[PDB]
Amino acid sequence: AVNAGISVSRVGGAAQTKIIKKLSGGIRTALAQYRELAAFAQFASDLDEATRKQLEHGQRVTELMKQKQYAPM
Amino acid sequence: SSGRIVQIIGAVIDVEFPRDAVPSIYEALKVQGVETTLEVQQQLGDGVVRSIAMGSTEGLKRGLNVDSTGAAISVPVGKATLGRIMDVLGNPIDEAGPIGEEERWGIHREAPSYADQAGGNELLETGIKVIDLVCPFAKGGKVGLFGGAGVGKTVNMMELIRNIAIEHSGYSVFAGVGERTREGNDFYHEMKDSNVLDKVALVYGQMNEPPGNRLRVALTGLTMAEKFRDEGRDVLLFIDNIYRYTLAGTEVSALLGRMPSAVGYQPTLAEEMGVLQERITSTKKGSITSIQAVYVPADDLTDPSPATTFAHLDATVVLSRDIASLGIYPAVDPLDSTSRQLDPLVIGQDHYDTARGVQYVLQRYKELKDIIAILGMDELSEADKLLVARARKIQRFLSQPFFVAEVFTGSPGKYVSLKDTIAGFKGILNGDYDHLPEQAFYMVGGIEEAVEKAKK
Amino acid sequence: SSGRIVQIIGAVIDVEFPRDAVPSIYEALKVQGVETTLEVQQQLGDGVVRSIAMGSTEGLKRGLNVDSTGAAISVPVGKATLGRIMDVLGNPIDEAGPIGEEERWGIHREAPSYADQAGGNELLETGIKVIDLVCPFAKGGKVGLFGGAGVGKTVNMMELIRNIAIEHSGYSVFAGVGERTREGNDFYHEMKDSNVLDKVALVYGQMNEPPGNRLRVALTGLTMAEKFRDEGRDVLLFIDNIYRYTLAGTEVSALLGRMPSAVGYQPTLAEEMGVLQERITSTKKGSITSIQAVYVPADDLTDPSPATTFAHLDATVVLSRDIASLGIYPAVDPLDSTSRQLDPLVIGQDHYDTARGVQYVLQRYKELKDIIAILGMDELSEADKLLVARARKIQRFLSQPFFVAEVFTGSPGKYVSLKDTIAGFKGILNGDYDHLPEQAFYMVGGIEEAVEKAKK
Amino acid sequence: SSGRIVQIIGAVIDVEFPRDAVPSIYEALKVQGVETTLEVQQQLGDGVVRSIAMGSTEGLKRGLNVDSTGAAISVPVGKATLGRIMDVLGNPIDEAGPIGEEERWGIHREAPSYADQAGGNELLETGIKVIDLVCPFAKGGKVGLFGGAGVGKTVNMMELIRNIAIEHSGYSVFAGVGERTREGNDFYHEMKDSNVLDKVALVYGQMNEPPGNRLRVALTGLTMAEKFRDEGRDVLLFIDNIYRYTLAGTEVSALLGRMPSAVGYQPTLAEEMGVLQERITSTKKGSITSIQAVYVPADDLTDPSPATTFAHLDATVVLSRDIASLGIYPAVDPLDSTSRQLDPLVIGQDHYDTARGVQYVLQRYKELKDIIAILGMDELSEADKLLVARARKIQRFLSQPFFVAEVFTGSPGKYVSLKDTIAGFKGILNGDYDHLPEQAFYMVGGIEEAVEKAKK
Amino acid sequence: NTIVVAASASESAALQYLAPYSGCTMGEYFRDRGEDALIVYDDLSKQAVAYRQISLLLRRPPGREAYPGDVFYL
Amino acid sequence: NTIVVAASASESAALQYLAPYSGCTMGEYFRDRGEDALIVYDDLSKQAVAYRQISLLLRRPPGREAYPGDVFYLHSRLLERASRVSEEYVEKFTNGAVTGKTGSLTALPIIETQAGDVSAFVPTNVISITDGQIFLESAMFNSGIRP
Amino acid sequence: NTIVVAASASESAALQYLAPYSGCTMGEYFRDRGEDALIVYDDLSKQAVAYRQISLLLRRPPGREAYPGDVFYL
Amino acid sequence: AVVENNACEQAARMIAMKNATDNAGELISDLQLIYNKARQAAITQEISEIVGGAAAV
Ligand SMILES: Nc1ncnc2c1ncn2[C@@H]1O[C@H](COP(=O)(O)OP(=O)(O)O)[C@@H](O)[C@H]1O
Ligand SMILES: Nc1ncnc2c1ncn2[C@@H]1O[C@H](COP(=O)(O)OP(=O)(O)O)[C@@H](O)[C@H]1O
Ligand SMILES: Nc1ncnc2c1ncn2[C@@H]1O[C@H](COP(=O)(O)OP(=O)(O)O)[C@@H](O)[C@H]1O
Ligand SMILES: [Mg+2]
Q: Is C154 in the pocket of ligand 2 (CB under 6 A)?
A: yes
Q: Is C184 in the pocket of ligand 2 (CB under 6 A)?
A: no
Give Cβ neighbours of residue D261 (< 8 Å, ≥ 6 apart).
D267, D269, D304, E52, E53, E56, E62, E66
Shortest CA gap B150–chain A (Å):
7
Nearest chain H residue to G61 by CA: give it: H56
Subunit partners of chain A (3 or more CB pairs within 8 A)? B
Q: Which of D379, D354, D357, D355 is nearest to D368 (CA)?
A: D379
SS3 content of chain C, % helix, strand, coil (to 5): 40, 20, 40
| Bridge partners of residue D76, in order along the sequence | D104
Ligand 1 midpoint to CA D278 (Å): 65
Whole-number Å distance between alpha carbons of D448 and D417: 13
Whole-number Å distance between alpha carbons of D372 and D25: 66
Method: cryo-EM
Q: Which of B265, B259, B262, B250 is nearest to F56 (CA)?
A: B259
Phi, psi of B199 (to 5 degrees): -100, 0
Give Cβ neighbours of residue H26 (< 8 Å, ≥ 6 apart).
none
| Per-residue 3-state assignment (H helix, E strand, C coil) for A24-70 | CCCHHHHHHHHHHHHHHCCCCCCCCHHHHHHHHHHHHHHHHCCCCCC
B341 near B119, Cβ under 8 Å? Answer: no
Whole-number Å distance between alpha carbons of B52 and C139: 57
User: Which protein residue's CA is at the shortest distance from atom 25 of ligand 2?
Assistant: C150
Ligand 1 midpoint to CA B71 (Å): 42
Whole-number Å distance between alpha carbons of D402 and D419: 19
CB spacing of H57 vs B257 below 8 angstroms: yes
Chain F residues lying within 8 Å of D264, measured CB to CB: 63-64
Q: Which of B456, B450, B445 is nearest to B414 (CA)?
A: B445
Whole-number Å distance between alpha carbons of F103 and F36: 6
**What number does the ligand 3 atom closest to the CA of D148 have?**
22
CA angle C278, C282, C287 (to 5 degrees): 145
Ligand 3 midpoint to CA D441 (Å): 21
Chain C residues lying within 8 Å of E61, measured CB to CB: 254, 260, 264
Residues contacting ligand 1 via CB (< 6 Å):
A 8-10, 12; B 147, 149-155, 329-330, 402, 405, 408-409
- Rounded to the nearest 10°, the torsion over CA H44, H46, H47, H52 is 120
CA angle A6, H32, G65 (to 5 degrees): 55
For residue D330, whether the previous peptide bond is cis, meaning omega lies within 30 degrees of 0, is yes
The amino acid at D33 = G
| F119 touching chain D per CB within 8 A | yes
| Bridge partners of residue D31, in order along the sequence | D66
Q: Is D409 in the pocket of ligand 3 (CB under 6 A)?
A: yes
CB spacing of B270 vs F50 below 8 angstroms: yes
Whole-number Å distance between alpha carbons of C415 and C418: 10
Alpha-carbon radius of gyration of chain F: 18
Shortest CA gap D76–chain H (Å):
41
Cβ neighbour number for residue E45 with a 10 Å cutoff: 7
CB spacing of B264 vs H49 below 8 angstroms: yes
Nearest chain F residue to B265 by CA: give it: F66
Ligand 4 midpoint to CA B145 (Å): 11
CA angle D342, D346, D347 (to 5 degrees): 65
Ligand 4 midpoint to CA B179 (Å): 7
Cβ neighbour number for residue D96 with a 10 Å cutoff: 10
Sort strands B142-147 and B123-124 into parallel, antiparallel or unpaired: unpaired
B400 near B443, Cβ under 8 Å? Answer: yes
Whole-number Å distance between alpha carbons of C166 and D225: 77
Subunit partners of chain D (3 or more CB pairs within 8 A)? E, F, H
CB spacing of C275 vs G50 below 8 angstroms: no
Whole-number Å distance between alpha carbons of H55 and H43: 18
Q: Which of C90, C81, C77 is nearest to C28 (CA)?
A: C90
Whole-number Å distance between alpha carbons of C164 and C126: 6
> For chain G, where are the alpha helices, taking DSSP H only?
13-31, 44-57
CA dist list (Å): D420 to B86, D131, D164, D398, D439: 94, 14, 18, 13, 19
Subunit partners of chain G (3 or more CB pairs within 8 A)? B, C, H
Cβ neighbour number for residue F6 with a 10 Å cutoff: 10
Chain G residues lying within 8 Å of B10, measured CB to CB: 60, 70
Cβ neighbour number for residue B28 with a 10 Å cutoff: 22
Shortest CA gap A67–chain B (Å):
24
| Bridge partners of residue D338, in order along the sequence | D316
Shortest CA gap E65–chain D (Å):
6
CA angle C313, C318, C322 (to 5 degrees): 170
Whole-number Å distance between alpha carbons of B359 and B429: 11
Q: Computed from CA positions of residues D208, D212, D213, D218, in that sequence, does the dihedral angle turn out positive or negative?
A: positive
C323-340 burial, b at 16+ Cβ within 10 Å, e below that, comes to bbeeebbbbbbbeebbbe
| Per-residue 3-state assignment (H helix, E strand, C coil) for chain F | CCCCCCCCCCCCHHHHHHHHHHHHHHHHHHHHCCCEEEEEECCHHHHHHHHHHHHHHCCCCECHHHCECCHHHHHHHHHCCCCEECHHHHHHHCCCCCCCCCEEEEEEECCCCECCECCCHHHHHHHHHCCCCCCCCHHHHHCCCCC
Give Cβ neighbours of residue F49 (< 8 Å, ≥ 6 apart).
B270
C-alpha H33: how far from chain center: 8
Give Cβ neighbours of residue C391 (< 8 Å, ≥ 6 apart).
C361, C362, C364, C365
Whole-number Å distance between alpha carbons of B84 and B67: 29
Ligand 4 midpoint to CA B95 (Å): 26
Sort strands D234-239 and D287-293 into parallel, antiparallel or unpaired: parallel
Chain B residues lying within 8 Å of G72, measured CB to CB: 207, 247, 251
| F50 touching chain B per CB within 8 A | yes
**What number does the ligand 3 atom closest to the CA of D159 have?**
1
**Known binding residues of B for ATP:** 147-154
Q: Which of B94, B104, B10, B6 is nearest to B53 (CA)?
A: B10
B200 near B173, Cβ under 8 Å? Answer: yes
Sort strands B287-295 and B234-239 into parallel, antiparallel or unpaired: parallel
Give Cβ neighbours of residue F69 (< 8 Å, ≥ 6 apart).
D211, D250, D251, D252, D253, D254, D255, F60, F61, F63
D280 near D241, Cβ under 8 Å? Answer: no
Chain C residues lying within 8 Å of B254, measured CB to CB: none
Q: How many CA atoms lie within 13 A of B150 on its CB side?
A: 14
Chain A residues lying within 8 Å of B377, measured CB to CB: 40-41, 43-45
Q: Which DSSP symbol is given to D284?
A: S
Whole-number Å distance between alpha carbons of B66 and E19: 65
**What number does the ligand 1 atom closest to the CA of B241 have?**
21
Ligand 1 midpoint to CA B400 (Å): 13
Chains C and E make contact, 3+ CB pairs within 8 Å: yes
For residue G62, whether the previous peptide bond is cis, meaning omega lies within 30 degrees of 0, is no
Nearest chain B residue to F6 by CA: give it: B114
Give Cβ neighbours of residue D8 (< 8 Å, ≥ 6 apart).
D14, D57, D60, D61, D62
Is D153 a known ligand-binding residue?
yes
Whole-number Å distance between alpha carbons of C212 and C38: 9
C72 near C108, Cβ under 8 Å? Answer: yes
C-alpha C340: how far from chain center: 18
Whole-number Å distance between alpha carbons of C333 and C319: 6
Is C221 a known ligand-binding residue?
no
User: Which protein residue's CA is at the shortest distance from atom 24 of ligand 3?
Assistant: D152
C361 near C429, Cβ under 8 Å? Answer: yes
3-class DSSP state of B71:
strand
> For B236-348, where are the alpha helices, taking DSSP H only?
243-253, 269-277, 304-309, 321-324, 344-347
| Bridge partners of residue B202, in order along the sequence | B85, B174
User: Which protein residue's CA is at the shortest distance from atom 25 of ligand 1?
Assistant: A10
Phi, psi of D24 (to 5 degrees): -75, 165
Whole-number Å distance between alpha carbons of A45 and C19: 88
Whole-number Å distance between alpha carbons of D85 and D95: 9
3-class DSSP state of B11:
coil
CB spacing of H52 vs E61 below 8 angstroms: yes
Whole-number Å distance between alpha carbons of D195 and D332: 24
Is C147 a known ligand-binding residue?
yes
CB spacing of H53 vs G60 below 8 angstroms: no
G64 near C263, Cβ under 8 Å? Answer: no
Subunit partners of chain E (3 or more CB pairs within 8 A)? C, D, H
Q: Is D152 in the pocket of ligand 3 (CB under 6 A)?
A: yes
Q: Which residues surround ligand 4, an ion (CB under 5 A)?
A: B 154
Can you spell out the DSSP letters for D418-447? HHHHHHHHHHHHHTTTTTS-GGGSTT-SSH
For residue C330, whether the previous peptide bond is cis, meaning omega lies within 30 degrees of 0, is yes
Chains G and E make contact, 3+ CB pairs within 8 Å: no
Q: Which of B281, B292, B176 is nearest to B230 (CA)?
A: B281
| F72 touching chain D per CB within 8 A | yes
| B374 touching chain C per CB within 8 A | yes
Ligand nearest to the CA of D152: 3
User: Which protein residue's CA is at the shortest distance from atom 15 of ligand 3?
Assistant: D152
Interface residues of chain H, partner chain D, Cβ below 8 Å? 33, 36-37, 39-40, 43-44, 47, 51
First-to-last alpha carbon distance for chain B, in angstroms, is 80
**What number does the ligand 3 atom closest to the CA of D331 have?**
8
Q: Computed from CA positions of residues D13, D18, D21, D22, in that sequence, does the dihedral angle turn out positive or negative?
A: positive
Q: What does this entry list as its resolution, in Å?
A: 2.8
B29 near B69, Cβ under 8 Å? Answer: yes
CB spacing of D278 vs E65 below 8 angstroms: no
Whole-number Å distance between alpha carbons of D357 and D353: 6
